[PDB]
Design an enzyme around this catalytic site. Structure first.
Site, short mmCIF file in Angstrom:
data_model
loop_
_atom_site.label_atom_id
_atom_site.label_comp_id
_atom_site.label_asym_id
_atom_site.label_seq_id
_atom_site.Cartn_x
_atom_site.Cartn_y
_atom_site.Cartn_z
N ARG A 106 1.05 -0.91 0.27
CA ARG A 106 -0.01 0.16 0.10
C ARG A 106 0.83 1.85 0.07
O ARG A 106 1.54 1.23 0.44
CB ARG A 106 -0.69 0.04 1.05
CG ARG A 106 -2.05 1.25 1.46
CD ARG A 106 -2.92 0.97 1.99
NE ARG A 106 -2.47 0.92 3.32
CZ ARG A 106 -3.52 0.51 4.54
NH1 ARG A 106 -4.88 -0.49 3.63
NH2 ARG A 106 -3.10 0.23 5.49
N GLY A 107 1.00 2.19 -0.70
CA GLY A 107 1.70 3.33 -1.29
C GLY A 107 0.97 4.50 -0.51
O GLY A 107 -0.36 4.36 0.28
N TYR A 139 -1.10 6.74 -1.71
CA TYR A 139 -2.36 7.16 -3.59
C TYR A 139 -2.92 5.61 -3.91
O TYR A 139 -3.95 5.61 -4.28
CB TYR A 139 -2.04 7.81 -4.58
CG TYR A 139 -1.43 8.84 -4.29
CD1 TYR A 139 -2.00 10.22 -3.46
CD2 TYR A 139 -0.30 9.39 -4.61
CE1 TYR A 139 -1.49 11.49 -2.77
CE2 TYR A 139 0.67 10.30 -4.63
CZ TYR A 139 0.33 11.58 -3.81
OH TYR A 139 0.61 12.58 -3.27
N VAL A 186 -2.00 -1.95 -4.16
CA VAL A 186 -1.96 -3.27 -5.15
C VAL A 186 -1.50 -4.40 -4.96
O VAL A 186 -1.62 -5.19 -2.98
CB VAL A 186 0.16 -3.00 -5.40
CG1 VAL A 186 0.43 -4.37 -5.91
CG2 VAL A 186 -0.02 -1.55 -6.79
N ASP A 245 10.69 8.88 -11.69
CA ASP A 245 10.82 7.57 -10.24
C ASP A 245 11.32 6.59 -10.58
O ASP A 245 10.86 5.92 -9.94
CB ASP A 245 8.94 7.46 -9.22
CG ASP A 245 9.51 7.20 -8.17
OD1 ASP A 245 10.33 7.28 -7.62
OD2 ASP A 245 8.18 5.90 -7.42
N1 LIG Z 1 2.80 0.19 -12.35
C1 LIG Z 1 2.32 -0.86 -11.73
O1 LIG Z 1 1.79 0.04 -10.35
C2 LIG Z 1 3.04 -1.62 -10.93
C3 LIG Z 1 2.95 -2.91 -11.69
C4 LIG Z 1 3.21 -3.72 -11.85
C5 LIG Z 1 3.67 -4.68 -10.39
C6 LIG Z 1 3.81 -3.47 -9.17
C7 LIG Z 1 3.67 -2.22 -9.76
N2 LIG Z 1 4.16 -3.87 -7.99
C8 LIG Z 1 4.13 -5.26 -8.00
N3 LIG Z 1 4.83 -5.15 -6.75
C9 LIG Z 1 4.96 -4.46 -5.31
C10 LIG Z 1 6.04 -3.85 -5.36
O2 LIG Z 1 7.31 -4.83 -5.66
C11 LIG Z 1 8.65 -3.55 -5.73
C12 LIG Z 1 10.16 -4.63 -5.89
C13 LIG Z 1 10.89 -4.87 -6.88
C14 LIG Z 1 12.04 -5.38 -6.93
N4 LIG Z 1 13.33 -4.70 -7.69
C15 LIG Z 1 14.21 -5.34 -8.26
C16 LIG Z 1 15.73 -4.76 -8.16
C17 LIG Z 1 16.60 -5.67 -8.42
C18 LIG Z 1 17.85 -5.69 -9.01
C19 LIG Z 1 17.96 -4.40 -9.47
O3 LIG Z 1 19.16 -4.07 -9.78
C20 LIG Z 1 19.10 -4.07 -11.17
F1 LIG Z 1 19.98 -3.30 -12.01
F2 LIG Z 1 18.26 -3.69 -12.05
F3 LIG Z 1 19.26 -5.36 -12.04
C21 LIG Z 1 16.66 -3.47 -8.64
CL1 LIG Z 1 17.26 -1.76 -9.68
C22 LIG Z 1 16.00 -4.17 -8.86
C23 LIG Z 1 4.33 -6.68 -8.36
C24 LIG Z 1 4.49 -8.07 -8.70
C25 LIG Z 1 5.00 -8.21 -9.78
N5 LIG Z 1 4.62 -8.41 -10.99
C26 LIG Z 1 3.53 -6.65 -11.26
C27 LIG Z 1 3.55 -6.31 -10.35
#
Ligand SMILES: NC(=O)c1ccc2c(c1)nc(NCCOCCCCNCc1ccc(OC(F)(F)F)c(Cl)c1)c1ccncc12
Length: 327
Positions: free
Chosen positions: A45-46, A48, A51, A154
């Protein structure tokens, strides 16, 4: 007063698109069927919205539903229009449906599900190769949205979804995203503290896509130096001081002088005088495996006060740091 600024890339993309593209207030929402989706569990929950993990019972596939709080129910068209404009783009989360939630009586956005079962902090445990690989994947999403006349505003780890098993990345939460229009003054209360660009911290409203590139540099610095977050501000004022302790105060003053910015006088008693630190100052035996001359040069070119000087997403994709990544 402040000198104007415009993006050096994709400056006029919205002016040459039809008005229907960016005039989100005129957009007519095509509503789906809330009965197609069964909520399974609360994911978060954010401020606004909330999820939920859910099932689309028309295909038995997992989806994610964002239900807007009554307070945000009004300003949903901007996010919807941006998601529809970006749909199918590289590494952009897919908006699968828009339904009216039967309980809250507010809009509910239905998104593609990405397997989010990689626990702990994958963010701080990737190998050097995987950091480069995923950074390149984020850049494909950022160059796409910037080329489409949209700033994300963001960029942070919480908005980067990775299914590490299938090496799949999606850039999510376009709730703060905006259309870029040259000369438009934007709200500086965007991005999350540690990822806020200097333009936001000094209250410079005429910013652009380059704000996303500063946020990206913050993520890179945190990962390669194993320092989470890299710029650890106690509040928005201290956030600029933390930046100044690394980038120096001289370039900060040159940046504000160039754009004729009036620095908040509260900064006089806290900014002090600092010289730029060379990037090897942050290298140590526990992060040395993620640091390379290429990583340092790339990071140096993202983390610049002057928003017009940072690499664009396309310039970043040209960087030698990515030569080792299989394309
Ligand atoms: N549009 C929506 O409102 C939206 C749309 C889809 C989803 C959403 C919100 N929130 C979700 N879970 C709640 C938020 O959960 C956020 C967890 C973030 C995990 N960082 C993982 C991570 C790991 C490594 C990283 O480094 C890199 F270099 F990139 F590899 C980075 Cl930068 C980030 C979700 C779960 C499953 N499938 C779709 C959605």
């Amino acid at each position: 007063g402040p000198v104007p600024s415009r993006a050096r890339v994709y400056t006029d993309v919205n002016t040459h698109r039809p008005s229907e593209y960016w005039d989100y207030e005129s957009h007519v929402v095509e509503w789906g069927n809330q009965d197609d989706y069964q909520l399974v569990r609360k994911l978060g929950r954010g401020k606004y919205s909330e999820v939920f993990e859910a099932i689309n019972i028309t295909n038995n596939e997992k989806v994610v539903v964002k239900i807007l709080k009554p307070v945000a129910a009004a300003k949903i068209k901007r996010e919807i229009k941006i998601l529809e404009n970006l749909r199918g783009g590289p590494n952009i989360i897919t908006l699968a449906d828009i339904v009216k939630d039967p309980v809250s009586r507010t809009p509910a956005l239905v998104f593609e599900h990405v397997n989010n079962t990689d626990f702990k902090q994958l963010y701080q445990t990737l190998t050097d190769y995987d950091i480069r690989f995923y950074m390149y994947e984020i850049l494909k999403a950022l160059d796409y949205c910037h080329s489409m006349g949209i700033m994300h505003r963001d960029v942070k780890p919480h908005n980067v979804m990775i299914d590490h098993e299938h090496r799949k990345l999606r850039l999510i939460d376009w709730g703060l995203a905006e259309f870029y229009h040259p000369g438009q003054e934007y709200n500086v209360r965007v991005a999350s503290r540690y990822f806020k660009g200097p333009e936001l911290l000094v209250d410079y409203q005429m910013y652009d896509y380059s704000l996303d590139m500063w946020s990206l540099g913050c993520m890179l610095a945190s990962m390669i130096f194993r320092k989470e977050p890299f710029f650890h501000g106690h509040d928005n004022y201290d956030q600029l001081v933390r930046i100044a302790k690394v980038l120096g105060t001289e370039d900060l003053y040159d940046y504000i002088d160039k754009y004729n910015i009036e620095l908040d006088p509260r900064f006089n008693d806290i900014l002090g005088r600092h010289s730029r630190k060379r990037w090897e100052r942050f290298v140590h035996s526990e992060n040395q495996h993620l640091v390379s001359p290429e990583a340092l040069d790339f990071l140096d070119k993202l983390l610049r006060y002057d928003h017009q000087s940072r690499l664009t997403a396309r310039e970043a994709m040209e960087h030698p740091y990515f030569y080792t990544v299989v394309k």
